[PDB]
Amino acid sequence: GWVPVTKLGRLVKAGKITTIEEIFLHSLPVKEFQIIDTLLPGLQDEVMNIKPVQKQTRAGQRTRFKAVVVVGDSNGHVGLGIKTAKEVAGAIRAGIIIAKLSVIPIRRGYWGTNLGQPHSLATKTTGKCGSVTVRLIPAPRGSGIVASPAVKKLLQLAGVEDVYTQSNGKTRTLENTLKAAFVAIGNTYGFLTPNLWAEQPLPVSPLDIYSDEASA
Amino acid sequence: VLVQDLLHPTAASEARKHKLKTLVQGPRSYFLDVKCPGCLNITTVFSHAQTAVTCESCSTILCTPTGGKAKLSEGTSFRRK
Amino acid sequence: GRMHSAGKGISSSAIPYSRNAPAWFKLSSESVIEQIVKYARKGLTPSQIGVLLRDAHGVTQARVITGNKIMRILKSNGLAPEIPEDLYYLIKKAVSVRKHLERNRKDKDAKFRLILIESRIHRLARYYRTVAVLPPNWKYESATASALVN
Amino acid sequence: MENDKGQLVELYVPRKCSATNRIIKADDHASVQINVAKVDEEGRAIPGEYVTYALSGYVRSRGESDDSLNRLAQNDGLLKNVWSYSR
Amino acid sequence: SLPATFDLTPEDAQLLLAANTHLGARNVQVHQEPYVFNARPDGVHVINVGKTWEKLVLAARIIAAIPNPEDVVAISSRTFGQRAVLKFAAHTGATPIAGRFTPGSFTNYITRSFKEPRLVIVTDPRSDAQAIKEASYVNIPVIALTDLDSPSEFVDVAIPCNNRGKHSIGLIWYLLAREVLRLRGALVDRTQPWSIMPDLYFYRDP
Amino acid sequence: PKRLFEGNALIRRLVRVGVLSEDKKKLDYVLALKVEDFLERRLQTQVYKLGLAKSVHHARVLITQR
Amino acid sequence: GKGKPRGLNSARKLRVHRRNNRWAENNYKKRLLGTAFKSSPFGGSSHAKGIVLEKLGIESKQPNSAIRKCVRVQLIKNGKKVTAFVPNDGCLNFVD
Amino acid sequence: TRSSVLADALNAINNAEKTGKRQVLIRPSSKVIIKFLQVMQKHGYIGEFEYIDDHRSGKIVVQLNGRLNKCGVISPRFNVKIGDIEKWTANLLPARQFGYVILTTSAGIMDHEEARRKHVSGKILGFVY
RNA sequence: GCGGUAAUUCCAGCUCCAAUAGCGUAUAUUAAAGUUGUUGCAGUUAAAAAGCUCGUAGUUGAACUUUGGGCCCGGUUGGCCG
RNA sequence: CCAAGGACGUUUUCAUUAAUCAAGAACGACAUAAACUAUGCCGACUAGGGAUCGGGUGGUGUUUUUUUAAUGACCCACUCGGCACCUUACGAGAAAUCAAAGUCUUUGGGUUCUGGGGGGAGUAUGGUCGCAAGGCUGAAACUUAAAGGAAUUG
RNA sequence: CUUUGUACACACC
């Protein structure tokens, strides 16, 4: 059983929104994970590294484990979660949960001539976390994801077949480069392109239209 | 304010600014035509007179220079031209 | 700018937009040209001419009343000085400061401002030589500065 | 956008702000959607009939949401003399 | 547009300059307020009352658009208007929070006071800054009773009044309830006034 | 002219070998090739596909033994 | 304007500044001064032959307690003394 | 001192578009500014603009749309041959389907696409996307 | 960093791994290196703004001068007609 | 007493005379400093708020003189130019913090100087200036896997 | 127990 407490969770329990694109369309805050793995059943998880963190006290050193998890399905939707916990299996468990609540879409585009399905990104983009800057550049077909294997795993979970990557800063800090890559793949839907210059009729929210299958 | 008319500012605010900070720069000074007691001899005096301006007929000095607008003497009759 | 100080203050004149001006002035052009040549006959710099026609009579600028500017008609009327007014005021300020320095040796900021004044003098002399309003080989030295004020 | 011959692609064509005409991201949690009901000749609003104005998080964070809302409200005619073009 | 029955009628204008709503703040002035109108000597300012009336009928058109009346939240941490927001709660759907606004009330689903609305209405954005900040997280529109020096950031519809007066806050809140009650349709008489006196929406010292 | 001449030559060569299909002749499916399409055209796997060997290793020892 | 000149006729300044700042690296100065030719024991060569002079029992640095079983040799081409470490286990019985 | 007037112009456009305002004042309006804004206007990036003239140098008032991401100048104006046009558009454009590099050729100031169509080259001025 | 009598790191056996008729070591050099920075570094506190000013060479330097409107001719990409 | 200087005011004059500066020169508690804002100069733009200093404009504003004029000193509103102060972060940063240390991978407004892990070492030598003390320029052999910055828990 | 300083971390031996 689920028994959600949100109007959004109650409406997706009822089956009112049949695809996740209304959530990003109306910028609704995803608030419980069961919305995500009900609407997106095809996502897989991978845990990159487990690093011990130490908090030093007057009596020994308290140990916990920080686990980073990247989830997502191989067409469109990516999530990244970082959670520290006193036990390791709870750390991957809360990691996949937090990575489920952080699902964002990807602007996949064409490097040229727009022939088939979209293989690369639409534009160059960057992300910065700490001292780490990650730059993503569109690449021709069959070039592959030329990247360090952590962010290579991230964008092959994203759905890109080929991209060029550049990095600057202390990239050996894994959390900072994964968060910078997450910001870079999140900024792809921040750029305004001339194919998006057309105006839209501003669609009405599902939170308002189906408001009597809501919480009240 | 993120939408405003830079082409047509209101008269109060365009008179509010410094003279070089308007739409087109222009002087805020003016010329007066001043009549002195005795002989008529209408004179034109700039507002920031910068010197002791007298009537051409006789030494009947109308303004004394001051670091801003120059003060005019006690017996005058001036109009803005 | 203000190369010989640190001030950034802006204070100047704002010339009006009316190039033909001012539709309340009744004197003729030749009246004010004879006014400038009569006023420059008694030995006045063109800045004093401009302010003195600006305040005694109604003259906004002599450029807009006549067809041309001031020492253009002075050099056409044969009253152009052998050196123009800005360099002349700079060199007379220089010989005044040098007179102070020969009077009092220890005014050492006066030495500093003397170097500043001769720097401005050499810059204007270079500009006036490359436009040949001064002949080439003209150079400023202090012994000729004592008599060049005239 | 499109590929060569039909088959509409680019899932989630995003909304655009009605004030600065920039697009609104998926996690822009400060962005809002003002819904104004319109009135038909009786002083009463009709349920389901709206005009709709989307505001991004940046203009709302700068405090300029109310002046821009004044401008788009007066542009649509439902407001009369609050916002002036001449400032 | 509007069918011109919603203009500022003279008796409501008599109420607004009876409550001294036009007495705004001092010469301190937020630059995002062009409602100032003949800045008066002593340094106090007079606001365009007609602009306040059109902003208030805007706020009524905002509130009437929401289907469920229980999905609007009235905030009062300032001690001068808890009775007014409670009478708004009694007269409409209008769930109130009077007094201390608990942090994590719009986020943080675990808490016992978890509301998540479609609208929040405040009195003073300076005093209710936590409610405005929490509305900024969950994509919530804001209607406010702003000042001439109030921090208008994250504020969508700002009704220009003064919140330093006892009469003005309660009476403006009363006109908001009156106009939303006409727009919903229970108050069927557009010309006739409401039988409820504005003296109901006032703060009393005991 | 350079693109036309060398592109038509390159797709002509790749469709002559068999590493590229006859309907993929747009010079960008050339960028979509993989190494398995090259590996499928060796004489080893062709002897296997023709049914003379029953394995790739029997194909190797059949080819090398003339 | 970010330090360096950016004018279209300022290539000489960039070249001379790049030379002066190229002298600040370690490998460039080591190559251009010919320090491998002059002050290196090998004279810039990869290998060198020599005559063993004696054996040493060189201690290992901290924290490590061992004796490293080195030798002192003299190079044929220059004639300077050189300490060399005999690599593996029991090989000091081969280099007497 | 004020060296590149076009640089200050494009910087003013960039700052006004980053702040979100829909209008911007430019001082003091050389000809290449007018041609630059004409090129940006014909591609649907800015819209209408206005030439205030005082008797000194002129001012420009531009109405800004939301369509502009970044406009920039390149200083100094490098000499660009034919191969350097697509080396530059590889260098400093976002993608291969949009974005325009502006260069002044002897046949006027134009974007890189119609410079490719006219088969001319020149000196690089700036870029817009 | 391992070895101080329970060595996953030494000496051997077994097993496994990587390249393979090739594989290791030393030296130099290139990429990695946005640690030479034109593209493309940094200078408050991590290495680094000359004590301040004048000043020659060097580098760089406000705006403005023919624009717009028409009338024809003929090429390339297309396009039903195939 | 002597000259100099900034800002202001200006419908005064010149006309691009300019910005930064190797060499060189002046000043510097002989040429130094924790000579510091540890933040080069010039130019443009970008959120505020009040106080203060110098000037100017206006307000039948207040007060004083000769109730009353002009002044002056206040007050109000403004504007220019300063030393600064307080709040935020759209932005920057590794952070402390910053309206500049912002408009820098969406990387070019102009220009001068300096640095390339830590010691050896601002040492030796060679020049150069100084009466001297010293000042400027200034290595290498060798040695080492860290020195160092900002924040968090004890 | 708060604040403050540290070049202490096998921690002021």
Author numbering:
A (entry chain R): 34 to 249
B (entry chain f): 2 to 82
C (entry chain Y): 2 to 151
D (entry chain a): 1 to 87
E (entry chain P): 2 to 207
F (entry chain W): 67 to 132
G (entry chain c): 2 to 97
H (entry chain b): 2 to 130
Quoted from the paper:
In actively translating 80S ribosomes the ribosomal protein eS7 of the 40S subunit is monoubiquitinated by the E3 ligase Not4 and deubiquitinated by Otu2 upon ribosomal subunit recycling. eS7 poly- and monoubiquitination is antagonized by deubiquitinating enzymes Ubp3 (USP10 in human) and Otu230,33, While Ubp3 preserves the eS7 monoubiquitination, Otu2 was shown to specifically remove the monoubiquitin attached to Lys83 of eS730. Here, structural analysis by cryo-electron microscopy of native and reconstituted Otu2-bound ribosomal complexes reveals that Otu2 engages 40S subunits mainly between ribosome recycling and initiation stages. Otu2 binds to several sites on the intersubunit surface of the 40S that are not occupied by any other 40S-binding factors. This binding mode explains the discrimination against 80S ribosomes via the largely helical N-terminal domain of Otu2 as well as the specificity for mono-ubiquitinated eS7 on 40S.
In addition to the native sample, we generated an Otu2-40S complex sample in vitro for cryo-EM analysis. To that end, we reconstituted an Otu2-eS7-Ub-40S complex using an in vitro ubiquitination system. Herein, purified 80S ribosomes were monoubiquitinated with purified Not4 E3 ligase, Ubc4 (E2), Uba1 (E1), ubiquitin and ATP to obtain 80S with monoubiquitinated eS7 (eS7-Ub-80S). These ribosomes were split into subunits and purified eS7-Ub-40S were incubated with purified recombinant Otu2 to ensure efficient deubiquitination activity in this system. After observing complete eS7-deubiquitination by recombinant purified wild-type (wt) Otu2, we used the eS7-Ub-40S for reconstitution with a 5x molar excess of purified catalytically inactive otu2-C178S to form stable complexes and determined the structure by cryo-EM. All described structures were refined to a high average resolution of 3.0 Å for Otu2-Ub-43S-PIC, 3.3 Å for Otu2-Ub-48S-IC, 3.8 Å for Otu2-pre-40S, and 3.0/3.2 Å for the two bodies of Otu2-Ub-40S. Further insight into the role of Otu2 could be gained from our in vitro reconstituted Otu2-40S structure, which shows that presence of the Otu2-NTD alone on 40S would sterically clash with the 60S subunit in context of an 80S ribosome. Most intriguingly, α4 occupies the binding position of LSU protein eL19, that forms the functionally important intersubunit bridge eB1270. Helix α4 of Otu2 occupies a very similar position on ES6e, most likely involving basic amino acids including a patch of four consecutive lysines and arginines (Lys116-Arg119; BP1). Moreover, binding of the α1-α2 hairpin induces a small translational movement of the lower h44 towards the left foot to form the binding pocket.
